[PDB]
Amino acid sequence: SIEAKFKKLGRQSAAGLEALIRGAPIEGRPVDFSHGDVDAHEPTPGAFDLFSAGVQSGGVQAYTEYRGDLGIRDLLAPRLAAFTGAPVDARDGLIITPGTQGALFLAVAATVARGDKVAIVQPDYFANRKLVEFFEGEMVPVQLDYVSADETRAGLDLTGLEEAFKAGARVFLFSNPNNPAGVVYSAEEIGQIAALAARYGATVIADQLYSRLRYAGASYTHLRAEAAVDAENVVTIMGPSKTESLSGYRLGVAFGSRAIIARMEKLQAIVSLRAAGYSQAVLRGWFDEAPGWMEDRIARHQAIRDELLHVLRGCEGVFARTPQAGSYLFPRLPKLAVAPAEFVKILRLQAGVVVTPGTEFSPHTADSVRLNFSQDHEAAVAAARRIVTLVERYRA
Amino acid sequence: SIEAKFKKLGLEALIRGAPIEGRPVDFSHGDVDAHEPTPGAFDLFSAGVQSGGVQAYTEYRGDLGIRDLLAPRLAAFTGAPVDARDGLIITPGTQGALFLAVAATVARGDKVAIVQPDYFANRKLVEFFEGEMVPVQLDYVSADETRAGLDLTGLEEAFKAGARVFLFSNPNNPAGVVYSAEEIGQIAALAARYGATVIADQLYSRLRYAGASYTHLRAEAAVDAENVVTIMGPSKTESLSGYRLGVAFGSRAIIARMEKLQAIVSLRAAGYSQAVLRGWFDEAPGWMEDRIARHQAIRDELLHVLRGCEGVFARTPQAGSYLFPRLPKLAVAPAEFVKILRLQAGVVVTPGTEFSPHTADSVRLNFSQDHEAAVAAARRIVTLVERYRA
Ligand SMILES: [Cl-]
Ligand SMILES: [Cl-]
Ligand SMILES: [Cl-]
Ligand SMILES: [Cl-]
Ligand SMILES: [Cl-]
Ligand SMILES: [Cl-]
Ligand SMILES: [Cl-]
Ligand SMILES: [Cl-]
Ligand SMILES: [Cl-]
Ligand SMILES: [Cl-]
Ligand SMILES: [Cl-]
């Protein structure tokens, strides 16, 4: 039934909160932590010049093959090969998409049929469950036991993954670094994921969107380079939307399995034809930015990461994993005198802070909220202090 | 089966004589060097990038300010109200709108009425969502140019058989014919009578030739505005395809479903691209008129050349830049003749099988091209038809 299918995809007012609100607002600059601030951390220098050169070049840029401009795919494949530590095939193993979201949609569409079991991590990216269920697959959840003082692994329940595959799951989709928690899977976790997938003949979609924004002294392991895994059963997706602040151009890529990439190409034709022709041109600069630019960017984000962690952990009932790549923090809040959903509204009403409710990522992370901390440094820190002040005001 | 599902989404001995040389022309899509993107569109994109994060990120359904600008423009154009808040979505191209509109209206097993010939995606989308296409013949091969030639009895019978969606392009891609006031009035009356939803793909409806009428389905008194979705955008007429922008408007129920799905298909139309829509339907006085006049001259000359060959038929395009000539019996197959036109004339045309299984002896040209190059290429096409004539 079309109606039920789509039901599953579904100023701040005080209405319904009048008996619950305590005190007056806390003055300060509003911060929307729901996504990155591309004014505080600008799009790659040079990107707009590349876009402008493409427009001037004209119809050759405006129209491309459905899988993406050939010249740009040929430029990108060596860069993406060097980054991930395994071969990339420009011609048949690489598609350019409308955002990494574009790639994710296509990748799930090309791999999940009606009734197929799909292993999905909890917590993980908001679209993952919704995609599986839109294509009438059956999610088999795999717990991420990320709540731990042991920060040498993400905490994936690998026995749970294996059991998912024993039960008939032939697809596994995950983000690395994890959105929302910012944890990165260890070498051993990725090795076992690779071995389990190969063992059961499962396809893996590895969403490495934020994997380039990797903090000093964090390790990162690319599933697609594992000796245990068959390269032709892995699709890796990533792009420049967040690390490089190019979200406004709407670009992503997917690479790996030729059979799956060929399916994603055929589908892209009828989903949106192509990634915007003119947008594609900015990818000529991707992984070829000025020396030290990415390194400074990672350093500026790491300073924000560390001060936000100091402020949040300063609150006695708050737990948060250290993010190891990307710009997400996922603090678990204490018992409050209001429900989690009510507190999110109250943060906006009384602190001018937007945060993402933890229920977007799993039904079992309801008392967490997600922050995207790619923000103005000082505004972000001041906002965080308002959050914890309100956590104290509403503490059960 | 997933393999079977995606399977549906897909000379030397025969050569006569030497090639014919001349400037090559790709008629498979429009030439936006010959017919430039709207003046000022790039300045809008640039000002939007300068404005920064407020433009890079929008609501999934599209920038609100831009939806508010567009709704009265689309209302004046189509002649019926447009609801910017709950009745209008900005998509990645009109293709993007088409995908979401079919997804939002076609469940597994549903009968969907589809025109033959029509746009390449229409059959593929219905089949991707496991709908059952019920075909409706367009009898466009006629000297009568007062109507497109849709089999309205066939449409009614589709609805009698249980079809509750009807999707069609107007002007028709590939033939370029526009549905008459009577044809559109009757599609509205039939849809209302059977409670069917209609998706009106009016992508090329703005490039309307002088002396041609155009009738908007969504303005028909007989039709329920809440069971119509109209899709269009600036990709072809305005040469903005490279920004990847379309809109859908109409039914609040269906548009809501489209917005929810867009969130997981691609999040949004590219935030920076969206800025260029601030100029759409606000181009300088005379600009659209001049563009139509330039295209109409191309149209007329290409028709003169193509019809000069005895065995060629083509309907006069009434809106948009598509011609769809039917070719005589050749000593080679149609598929082979398209390869020969490339190799011996430097001409790319689109095979008629993209649009219907029963128009294999036709080819589609997009004639939004350099005028002189386009006419010289047409002459090469006709020379080779004569050379290969069975
Ligand atoms: Cl290309
Ligand atoms: Cl997100
Ligand atoms: Cl965007
Ligand atoms: Cl195209
Ligand atoms: Cl930075
Ligand atoms: Cl010669
Ligand atoms: Cl908005
Ligand atoms: Cl087309
Ligand atoms: Cl977003
Ligand atoms: Cl023009
Ligand atoms: Cl004949």
The domain limits of chain A are 1-60+289-394, 61-288
Which runs of consecutive H residues, i.e. helices, occur in chain A? Answer: 2-7, 47-57, 59-62, 70-84, 99-109, 126-134, 158-166, 187-200, 258-271, 277-280, 293-313, 340-351, 377-393
Chain A interface, best mutation among B118, B264, B276, by max A CB count within 10 A: B264
Chain B interface, best mutation among A1, A3, A6, by max B CB count within 10 A: A6
Residue A69 C-alpha to ligand 1 middle, in angstroms?
4
Which residues of A fall within a CB distance of 8 Å from B239?
Answer: 62
Which residues have C-beta within 8 Å of that of residue A49, sequence separation ≥ 6? none
Residue from the list A10, A250, A278 with its beta carbon closest to the beta carbon of B242: A278
Residue from the list B6, B239, B265 with its beta carbon closest to the beta carbon of A271: B265
Q: Which residues pair with A336 in a beta bridge?
A: A395
* B105 part of contact set with chain A, CB < 8 Å: yes
CATH topology match: A1-60+289-394 vs A61-288: no
Query: Half-sphere exposure of residue A332, counting CA atoms within 13 Å on the CB side?
Result: 14
Report how this structure was experimentally obtained: X-ray
Peptide bond between residue B171 and the one before it cis (omega within 30 degrees of 0): yes
Contact A111 B57 (CB under 8 A): no
Question: Across chain B, which distance is largest between two alpha carbons, in Å?
Answer: 62
Q: Which residues pair with A100 in a beta bridge?
A: none
Closest ligand to Cα B270: 3
**Angstrom distance (rounded) from CA A111 to CA A94:** 16
Residue of chain B whose alpha carbon sits nearest to that of A35: B57
**Domain at A61-288, CATH class:** alpha beta
Contact A35 B57 (CB under 8 A): yes
Resolution (A): 2.2
Question: Across chain A, which distance is largest between two alpha carbons, in Å?
Answer: 62
Do residues A31 and A380 touch, judged by C-beta distance below 8 A? yes
User: Residue B302 carries which side chain, given as an amino acid letter?
Assistant: L
Burial class (CB in 10 A: 0-12, 13-18, 19+), B40: middle
Residue from the list A62, A111, A249 with its beta carbon closest to the beta carbon of B270: A249
Reported as type and span, the H/E element at residue B365 is strand B363-366
DSSP B87: S
Burial class (CB in 10 A: 0-12, 13-18, 19+), A209: buried
Contact B260 A55 (CB under 8 A): no
Pick the closest to residue B52 from A278, A42, A281, A34 (CA basis).
Answer: A42
> What torsion do the CA atoms of B36, B37, B43, B48 make, to the nearest 10 degrees?
-160
How many H-runs (helices) and E-runs (strands) does chain B carry? 13, 12
Looking at CATH, the fold of the domain delimited by B55-282 is given as Aspartate Aminotransferase; domain 2 (3.40.640)
Do residues B371 and B18 touch, judged by C-beta distance below 8 A? no
Domain B1-54+283-388: CATH superfamily is Aspartate Aminotransferase, domain 1 (3.90.1150.10)
Residue from the list A6, A127, A249 with its beta carbon closest to the beta carbon of B272: A249
Contact B242 A273 (CB under 8 A): no
CA dihedral sign of residues B376, B377, B380, B382: negative
Which residues have C-beta within 8 Å of that of residue B148, sequence separation ≥ 6? B138, B140, B170, B172, B175, B177, B178, B179, B180, B183
Find the discontinuities in chain A where C to next N exceeds 2.5 angstroms and give the residue preceding each. 10
* A6 part of contact set with chain B, CB < 8 Å: yes
Angle at A316 between CA A312 and CA A320, to 5 degrees: 40
**Angstrom distance (rounded) from CA B230 to CA B167:** 10
Kindly list the strands in the beta sheet with B111-116, ordered across the sheet, starting from the edge strand earlier in the chain. Answer: B88-91, B246-250, B228-232, B197-201, B165-169, B111-116, B132-137
Q: Which residues, by Cβ under 5 Å, contact ligand 5, an ion?
A: A 41, 297, 300
Instruction: Write phi, then psi, for B313 (nearest 5 degrees).
Output: -115, 140
* B39 part of contact set with chain A, CB < 8 Å: no
Look up the CATH number of domain A1-60+289-394: 3.90.1150.10
* A4 part of contact set with chain B, CB < 8 Å: no
Closest ligand to Cα A71: 1
Contact A130 B264 (CB under 8 A): yes
* B269 part of contact set with chain A, CB < 8 Å: yes
DSSP B138: B
Q: Which two tokens stand for residue B356?
A: 């219907």
Residue of chain B whose alpha carbon sits nearest to that of A127: B264
State how far the alpha carbon of A137 is from the alpha carbons of A101, A117, A118, A157, A234, in Å: 19, 6, 7, 21, 19
Residue in this structure with the two tokens 């004014």, named with its chain if needed: A39
* A269 part of contact set with chain B, CB < 8 Å: yes
Q: Which residues pair with B38 in a beta bridge?
A: none
